[PDB]
PDB file of all heavy atoms in Angstrom:
ATOM      1  N   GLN S   8     -54.718 -86.295 -39.375  1.00 58.94           N
ATOM      2  CA  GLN S   8     -53.678 -85.618 -40.145  1.00 58.94           C
ATOM      3  C   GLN S   8     -54.082 -85.437 -41.617  1.00 58.94           C
ATOM      4  O   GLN S   8     -54.891 -86.263 -42.166  1.00 58.94           O
ATOM      5  CB  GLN S   8     -52.333 -86.365 -40.121  1.00 58.94           C
ATOM      6  CG  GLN S   8     -51.674 -86.488 -38.714  1.00 58.94           C
ATOM      7  CD  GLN S   8     -51.325 -85.156 -38.092  1.00 58.94           C
ATOM      8  OE1 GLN S   8     -50.330 -84.447 -38.495  1.00 58.94           O
ATOM      9  NE2 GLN S   8     -52.138 -84.742 -37.057  1.00 58.94           N
ATOM     10  N   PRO S   9     -53.522 -84.467 -42.275  1.00 57.62           N
ATOM     11  CA  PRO S   9     -53.867 -84.127 -43.702  1.00 57.62           C
ATOM     12  C   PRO S   9     -53.126 -85.075 -44.751  1.00 57.62           C
ATOM     13  O   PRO S   9     -52.221 -84.595 -45.440  1.00 57.62           O
ATOM     14  CB  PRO S   9     -53.413 -82.655 -43.904  1.00 57.62           C
ATOM     15  CG  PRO S   9     -52.311 -82.484 -42.820  1.00 57.62           C
ATOM     16  CD  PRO S   9     -52.709 -83.379 -41.660  1.00 57.62           C
ATOM     17  N   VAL S  10     -53.510 -86.292 -44.754  1.00 56.68           N
ATOM     18  CA  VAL S  10     -53.073 -87.302 -45.633  1.00 56.68           C
ATOM     19  C   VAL S  10     -54.260 -88.095 -46.109  1.00 56.68           C
ATOM     20  O   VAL S  10     -55.275 -88.164 -45.370  1.00 56.68           O
ATOM     21  CB  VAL S  10     -52.021 -88.249 -44.946  1.00 56.68           C
ATOM     22  CG1 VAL S  10     -50.841 -87.432 -44.418  1.00 56.68           C
ATOM     23  CG2 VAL S  10     -52.635 -89.067 -43.761  1.00 56.68           C
ATOM     24  N   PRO S  11     -54.236 -88.722 -47.248  1.00 55.66           N
ATOM     25  CA  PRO S  11     -55.319 -89.552 -47.692  1.00 55.66           C
ATOM     26  C   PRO S  11     -55.493 -90.752 -46.769  1.00 55.66           C
ATOM     27  O   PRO S  11     -54.468 -91.419 -46.392  1.00 55.66           O
ATOM     28  CB  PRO S  11     -54.925 -90.060 -49.032  1.00 55.66           C
ATOM     29  CG  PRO S  11     -53.739 -89.162 -49.481  1.00 55.66           C
ATOM     30  CD  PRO S  11     -53.076 -88.834 -48.169  1.00 55.66           C
ATOM     31  N   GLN S  12     -56.726 -91.064 -46.423  1.00 54.51           N
ATOM     32  CA  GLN S  12     -56.955 -91.969 -45.258  1.00 54.51           C
ATOM     33  C   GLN S  12     -57.080 -93.437 -45.672  1.00 54.51           C
ATOM     34  O   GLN S  12     -56.835 -94.348 -44.803  1.00 54.51           O
ATOM     35  CB  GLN S  12     -58.112 -91.481 -44.455  1.00 54.51           C
ATOM     36  CG  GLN S  12     -57.977 -90.129 -43.786  1.00 54.51           C
ATOM     37  CD  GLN S  12     -56.991 -90.144 -42.642  1.00 54.51           C
ATOM     38  OE1 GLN S  12     -55.920 -89.461 -42.646  1.00 54.51           O
ATOM     39  NE2 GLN S  12     -57.341 -90.837 -41.546  1.00 54.51           N
ATOM     40  N   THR S  13     -57.349 -93.666 -46.941  1.00 55.35           N
ATOM     41  CA  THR S  13     -57.526 -95.060 -47.517  1.00 55.35           C
ATOM     42  C   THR S  13     -57.040 -95.111 -49.013  1.00 55.35           C
ATOM     43  O   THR S  13     -56.914 -94.065 -49.662  1.00 55.35           O
ATOM     44  CB  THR S  13     -58.997 -95.489 -47.644  1.00 55.35           C
ATOM     45  OG1 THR S  13     -59.682 -94.640 -48.574  1.00 55.35           O
ATOM     46  CG2 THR S  13     -59.718 -95.493 -46.302  1.00 55.35           C
ATOM     47  N   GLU S  14     -56.798 -96.342 -49.471  1.00 57.29           N
ATOM     48  CA  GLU S  14     -56.584 -96.615 -50.889  1.00 57.29           C
ATOM     49  C   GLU S  14     -57.750 -96.166 -51.814  1.00 57.29           C
ATOM     50  O   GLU S  14     -57.530 -95.781 -52.959  1.00 57.29           O
ATOM     51  CB  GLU S  14     -56.343 -98.086 -51.086  1.00 57.29           C
ATOM     52  CG  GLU S  14     -54.928 -98.505 -50.534  1.00 57.29           C
ATOM     53  CD  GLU S  14     -53.818 -97.867 -51.270  1.00 57.29           C
ATOM     54  OE1 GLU S  14     -53.894 -97.637 -52.529  1.00 57.29           O
ATOM     55  OE2 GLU S  14     -52.794 -97.520 -50.601  1.00 57.29           O
ATOM     56  N   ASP S  15     -59.007 -96.237 -51.316  1.00 58.00           N
ATOM     57  CA  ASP S  15     -60.145 -95.757 -52.095  1.00 58.00           C
ATOM     58  C   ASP S  15     -60.072 -94.240 -52.299  1.00 58.00           C
ATOM     59  O   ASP S  15     -60.266 -93.770 -53.388  1.00 58.00           O
ATOM     60  CB  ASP S  15     -61.483 -96.081 -51.416  1.00 58.00           C
ATOM     61  CG  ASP S  15     -62.048 -97.405 -51.868  1.00 58.00           C
ATOM     62  OD1 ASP S  15     -61.873 -97.813 -53.023  1.00 58.00           O
ATOM     63  OD2 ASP S  15     -62.790 -98.050 -51.020  1.00 58.00           O
ATOM     64  N   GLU S  16     -59.754 -93.506 -51.219  1.00 59.46           N
ATOM     65  CA  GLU S  16     -59.570 -92.070 -51.327  1.00 59.46           C
ATOM     66  C   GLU S  16     -58.509 -91.776 -52.320  1.00 59.46           C
ATOM     67  O   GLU S  16     -58.687 -91.005 -53.251  1.00 59.46           O
ATOM     68  CB  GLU S  16     -59.279 -91.488 -49.979  1.00 59.46           C
ATOM     69  CG  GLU S  16     -58.749 -90.044 -49.921  1.00 59.46           C
ATOM     70  CD  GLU S  16     -58.879 -89.440 -48.588  1.00 59.46           C
ATOM     71  OE1 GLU S  16     -58.944 -90.178 -47.557  1.00 59.46           O
ATOM     72  OE2 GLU S  16     -58.923 -88.183 -48.425  1.00 59.46           O
ATOM     73  N   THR S  17     -57.353 -92.416 -52.135  1.00 62.40           N
ATOM     74  CA  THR S  17     -56.245 -92.385 -53.089  1.00 62.40           C
ATOM     75  C   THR S  17     -56.697 -92.640 -54.487  1.00 62.40           C
ATOM     76  O   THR S  17     -56.353 -91.885 -55.381  1.00 62.40           O
ATOM     77  CB  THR S  17     -55.103 -93.354 -52.703  1.00 62.40           C
ATOM     78  OG1 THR S  17     -54.461 -92.815 -51.527  1.00 62.40           O
ATOM     79  CG2 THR S  17     -54.114 -93.534 -53.785  1.00 62.40           C
ATOM     80  N   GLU S  18     -57.459 -93.709 -54.695  1.00 61.67           N
ATOM     81  CA  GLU S  18     -57.857 -94.118 -56.050  1.00 61.67           C
ATOM     82  C   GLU S  18     -58.704 -93.057 -56.765  1.00 61.67           C
ATOM     83  O   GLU S  18     -58.793 -93.045 -58.012  1.00 61.67           O
ATOM     84  CB  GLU S  18     -58.517 -95.475 -56.033  1.00 61.67           C
ATOM     85  CG  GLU S  18     -58.231 -96.355 -57.308  1.00 61.67           C
ATOM     86  CD  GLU S  18     -59.324 -96.302 -58.353  1.00 61.67           C
ATOM     87  OE1 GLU S  18     -60.314 -95.531 -58.170  1.00 61.67           O
ATOM     88  OE2 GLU S  18     -59.207 -96.984 -59.383  1.00 61.67           O
ATOM     89  N   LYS S  19     -59.371 -92.163 -56.018  1.00 60.60           N
ATOM     90  CA  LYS S  19     -60.243 -91.120 -56.562  1.00 60.60           C
ATOM     91  C   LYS S  19     -59.525 -89.691 -56.691  1.00 60.60           C
ATOM     92  O   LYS S  19     -60.150 -88.656 -57.038  1.00 60.60           O
ATOM     93  CB  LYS S  19     -61.506 -90.952 -55.674  1.00 60.60           C
ATOM     94  CG  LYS S  19     -62.653 -91.860 -56.044  1.00 60.60           C
ATOM     95  CD  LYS S  19     -62.823 -92.969 -55.066  1.00 60.60           C
ATOM     96  CE  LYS S  19     -64.159 -93.723 -55.325  1.00 60.60           C
ATOM     97  NZ  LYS S  19     -64.478 -94.743 -54.304  1.00 60.60           N
ATOM     98  N   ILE S  20     -58.207 -89.697 -56.338  1.00 60.60           N
ATOM     99  CA  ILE S  20     -57.418 -88.484 -56.497  1.00 60.60           C
ATOM    100  C   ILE S  20     -56.933 -88.389 -57.944  1.00 60.60           C
ATOM    101  O   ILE S  20     -56.413 -89.375 -58.464  1.00 60.60           O
ATOM    102  CB  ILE S  20     -56.163 -88.505 -55.563  1.00 60.60           C
ATOM    103  CG1 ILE S  20     -56.508 -88.538 -54.058  1.00 60.60           C
ATOM    104  CG2 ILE S  20     -55.255 -87.278 -55.929  1.00 60.60           C
ATOM    105  CD1 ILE S  20     -55.300 -88.734 -53.141  1.00 60.60           C
ATOM    106  N   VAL S  21     -57.098 -87.256 -58.499  1.00 63.54           N
ATOM    107  CA  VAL S  21     -56.955 -87.093 -59.898  1.00 63.54           C
ATOM    108  C   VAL S  21     -55.936 -85.952 -60.125  1.00 63.54           C
ATOM    109  O   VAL S  21     -55.236 -85.960 -61.166  1.00 63.54           O
ATOM    110  CB  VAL S  21     -58.330 -86.815 -60.652  1.00 63.54           C
ATOM    111  CG1 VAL S  21     -59.336 -87.852 -60.313  1.00 63.54           C
ATOM    112  CG2 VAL S  21     -58.873 -85.400 -60.372  1.00 63.54           C
ATOM    113  N   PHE S  22     -55.814 -84.994 -59.187  1.00 64.16           N
ATOM    114  CA  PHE S  22     -54.839 -83.889 -59.364  1.00 64.16           C
ATOM    115  C   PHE S  22     -53.891 -83.857 -58.192  1.00 64.16           C
ATOM    116  O   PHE S  22     -54.361 -84.017 -57.037  1.00 64.16           O
ATOM    117  CB  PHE S  22     -55.592 -82.536 -59.438  1.00 64.16           C
ATOM    118  CG  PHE S  22     -56.681 -82.417 -60.504  1.00 64.16           C
ATOM    119  CD1 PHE S  22     -57.904 -81.748 -60.208  1.00 64.16           C
ATOM    120  CD2 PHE S  22     -56.543 -82.961 -61.772  1.00 64.16           C
ATOM    121  CE1 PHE S  22     -58.900 -81.646 -61.188  1.00 64.16           C
ATOM    122  CE2 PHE S  22     -57.499 -82.863 -62.766  1.00 64.16           C
ATOM    123  CZ  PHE S  22     -58.715 -82.226 -62.455  1.00 64.16           C
ATOM    124  N   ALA S  23     -52.670 -83.454 -58.440  1.00 65.10           N
ATOM    125  CA  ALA S  23     -51.796 -83.007 -57.381  1.00 65.10           C
ATOM    126  C   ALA S  23     -52.296 -81.742 -56.720  1.00 65.10           C
ATOM    127  O   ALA S  23     -52.771 -80.815 -57.393  1.00 65.10           O
ATOM    128  CB  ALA S  23     -50.359 -82.863 -57.792  1.00 65.10           C
ATOM    129  N   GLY S  24     -52.205 -81.677 -55.385  1.00 66.67           N
ATOM    130  CA  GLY S  24     -52.449 -80.478 -54.694  1.00 66.67           C
ATOM    131  C   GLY S  24     -52.587 -80.725 -53.206  1.00 66.67           C
ATOM    132  O   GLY S  24     -52.572 -81.882 -52.761  1.00 66.67           O
ATOM    133  N   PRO S  25     -52.701 -79.633 -52.474  1.00 67.88           N
ATOM    134  CA  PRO S  25     -52.783 -79.775 -51.030  1.00 67.88           C
ATOM    135  C   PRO S  25     -54.014 -80.553 -50.494  1.00 67.88           C
ATOM    136  O   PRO S  25     -55.029 -80.683 -51.202  1.00 67.88           O
ATOM    137  CB  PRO S  25     -52.731 -78.313 -50.509  1.00 67.88           C
ATOM    138  CG  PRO S  25     -53.137 -77.472 -51.623  1.00 67.88           C
ATOM    139  CD  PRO S  25     -52.756 -78.186 -52.849  1.00 67.88           C
ATOM    140  N   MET S  26     -53.901 -81.103 -49.328  1.00 68.85           N
ATOM    141  CA  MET S  26     -55.079 -81.749 -48.672  1.00 68.85           C
ATOM    142  C   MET S  26     -55.789 -80.730 -47.735  1.00 68.85           C
ATOM    143  O   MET S  26     -57.042 -80.732 -47.747  1.00 68.85           O
ATOM    144  CB  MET S  26     -54.729 -82.969 -47.795  1.00 68.85           C
ATOM    145  CG  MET S  26     -54.027 -84.119 -48.410  1.00 68.85           C
ATOM    146  SD  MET S  26     -55.042 -85.153 -49.452  1.00 68.85           S
ATOM    147  CE  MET S  26     -56.260 -85.680 -48.218  1.00 68.85           C
ATOM    148  N   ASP S  27     -55.033 -79.953 -46.988  1.00 69.66           N
ATOM    149  CA  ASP S  27     -55.517 -79.108 -45.861  1.00 69.66           C
ATOM    150  C   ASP S  27     -56.140 -77.770 -46.170  1.00 69.66           C
ATOM    151  O   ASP S  27     -56.159 -77.337 -47.275  1.00 69.66           O
ATOM    152  CB  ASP S  27     -54.373 -78.758 -44.952  1.00 69.66           C
ATOM    153  CG  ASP S  27     -54.578 -79.284 -43.617  1.00 69.66           C
ATOM    154  OD1 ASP S  27     -55.580 -80.080 -43.521  1.00 69.66           O
ATOM    155  OD2 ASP S  27     -53.833 -78.912 -42.657  1.00 69.66           O
ATOM    156  N   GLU S  28     -56.623 -77.106 -45.089  1.00 68.60           N
ATOM    157  CA  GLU S  28     -57.040 -75.675 -45.207  1.00 68.60           C
ATOM    158  C   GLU S  28     -55.755 -74.843 -45.508  1.00 68.60           C
ATOM    159  O   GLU S  28     -54.751 -74.973 -44.868  1.00 68.60           O
ATOM    160  CB  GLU S  28     -57.728 -75.178 -43.844  1.00 68.60           C
ATOM    161  CG  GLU S  28     -56.921 -75.282 -42.483  1.00 68.60           C
ATOM    162  CD  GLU S  28     -57.366 -74.260 -41.392  1.00 68.60           C
ATOM    163  OE1 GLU S  28     -58.322 -73.527 -41.566  1.00 68.60           O
ATOM    164  OE2 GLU S  28     -56.725 -74.205 -40.306  1.00 68.60           O
ATOM    165  N   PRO S  29     -55.831 -73.974 -46.640  1.00 67.07           N
ATOM    166  CA  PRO S  29     -54.644 -73.095 -46.691  1.00 67.07           C
ATOM    167  C   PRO S  29     -54.527 -72.418 -45.301  1.00 67.07           C
ATOM    168  O   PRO S  29     -55.529 -72.122 -44.721  1.00 67.07           O
ATOM    169  CB  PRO S  29     -55.032 -72.104 -47.763  1.00 67.07           C
ATOM    170  CG  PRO S  29     -56.017 -72.778 -48.617  1.00 67.07           C
ATOM    171  CD  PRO S  29     -56.748 -73.794 -47.772  1.00 67.07           C
ATOM    172  N   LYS S  30     -53.351 -72.275 -44.777  1.00 67.26           N
ATOM    173  CA  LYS S  30     -53.028 -71.694 -43.481  1.00 67.26           C
ATOM    174  C   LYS S  30     -51.916 -70.758 -43.633  1.00 67.26           C
ATOM    175  O   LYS S  30     -51.122 -70.780 -44.583  1.00 67.26           O
ATOM    176  CB  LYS S  30     -52.596 -72.835 -42.526  1.00 67.26           C
ATOM    177  CG  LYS S  30     -53.670 -73.758 -42.021  1.00 67.26           C
ATOM    178  CD  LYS S  30     -53.260 -74.304 -40.649  1.00 67.26           C
ATOM    179  CE  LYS S  30     -53.540 -75.789 -40.536  1.00 67.26           C
ATOM    180  NZ  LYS S  30     -52.869 -76.344 -39.319  1.00 67.26           N
ATOM    181  N   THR S  31     -51.785 -69.787 -42.707  1.00 68.81           N
ATOM    182  CA  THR S  31     -50.549 -68.961 -42.676  1.00 68.81           C
ATOM    183  C   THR S  31     -49.692 -69.171 -41.512  1.00 68.81           C
ATOM    184  O   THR S  31     -50.050 -69.751 -40.499  1.00 68.81           O
ATOM    185  CB  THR S  31     -50.680 -67.406 -42.787  1.00 68.81           C
ATOM    186  OG1 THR S  31     -51.556 -66.949 -41.733  1.00 68.81           O
ATOM    187  CG2 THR S  31     -51.196 -66.976 -44.158  1.00 68.81           C
ATOM    188  N   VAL S  32     -48.449 -68.618 -41.686  1.00 69.53           N
ATOM    189  CA  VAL S  32     -47.483 -68.582 -40.666  1.00 69.53           C
ATOM    190  C   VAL S  32     -48.067 -68.050 -39.382  1.00 69.53           C
ATOM    191  O   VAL S  32     -47.802 -68.585 -38.299  1.00 69.53           O
ATOM    192  CB  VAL S  32     -46.152 -67.914 -41.071  1.00 69.53           C
ATOM    193  CG1 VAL S  32     -45.223 -67.764 -39.952  1.00 69.53           C
ATOM    194  CG2 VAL S  32     -45.473 -68.846 -42.168  1.00 69.53           C
ATOM    195  N   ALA S  33     -48.751 -66.945 -39.488  1.00 70.45           N
ATOM    196  CA  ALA S  33     -49.240 -66.264 -38.358  1.00 70.45           C
ATOM    197  C   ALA S  33     -50.263 -67.098 -37.521  1.00 70.45           C
ATOM    198  O   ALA S  33     -50.374 -66.874 -36.308  1.00 70.45           O
ATOM    199  CB  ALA S  33     -49.836 -64.899 -38.770  1.00 70.45           C
ATOM    200  N   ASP S  34     -50.979 -67.990 -38.201  1.00 73.16           N
ATOM    201  CA  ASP S  34     -51.885 -68.966 -37.518  1.00 73.16           C
ATOM    202  C   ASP S  34     -51.129 -69.904 -36.527  1.00 73.16           C
ATOM    203  O   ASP S  34     -51.752 -70.473 -35.605  1.00 73.16           O
ATOM    204  CB  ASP S  34     -52.658 -69.892 -38.475  1.00 73.16           C
ATOM    205  CG  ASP S  34     -53.646 -69.172 -39.342  1.00 73.16           C
ATOM    206  OD1 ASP S  34     -54.281 -68.205 -38.951  1.00 73.16           O
ATOM    207  OD2 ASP S  34     -53.825 -69.723 -40.528  1.00 73.16           O
ATOM    208  N   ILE S  35     -49.828 -70.118 -36.683  1.00 76.25           N
ATOM    209  CA  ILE S  35     -49.147 -71.227 -36.014  1.00 76.25           C
ATOM    210  C   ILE S  35     -48.610 -70.873 -34.724  1.00 76.25           C
ATOM    211  O   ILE S  35     -48.005 -69.775 -34.605  1.00 76.25           O
ATOM    212  CB  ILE S  35     -47.880 -71.703 -36.889  1.00 76.25           C
ATOM    213  CG1 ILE S  35     -48.408 -72.091 -38.295  1.00 76.25           C
ATOM    214  CG2 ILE S  35     -47.148 -72.859 -36.183  1.00 76.25           C
ATOM    215  CD1 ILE S  35     -49.511 -73.123 -38.475  1.00 76.25           C
TER     216      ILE S  35
END
């Protein structure tokens, strides 16, 4: 799933923003 997988990964996050591939409605 598109969430940070560890506290280390978290600790290196500096900006807000999405985790995943931008996707569209039509993909779903």
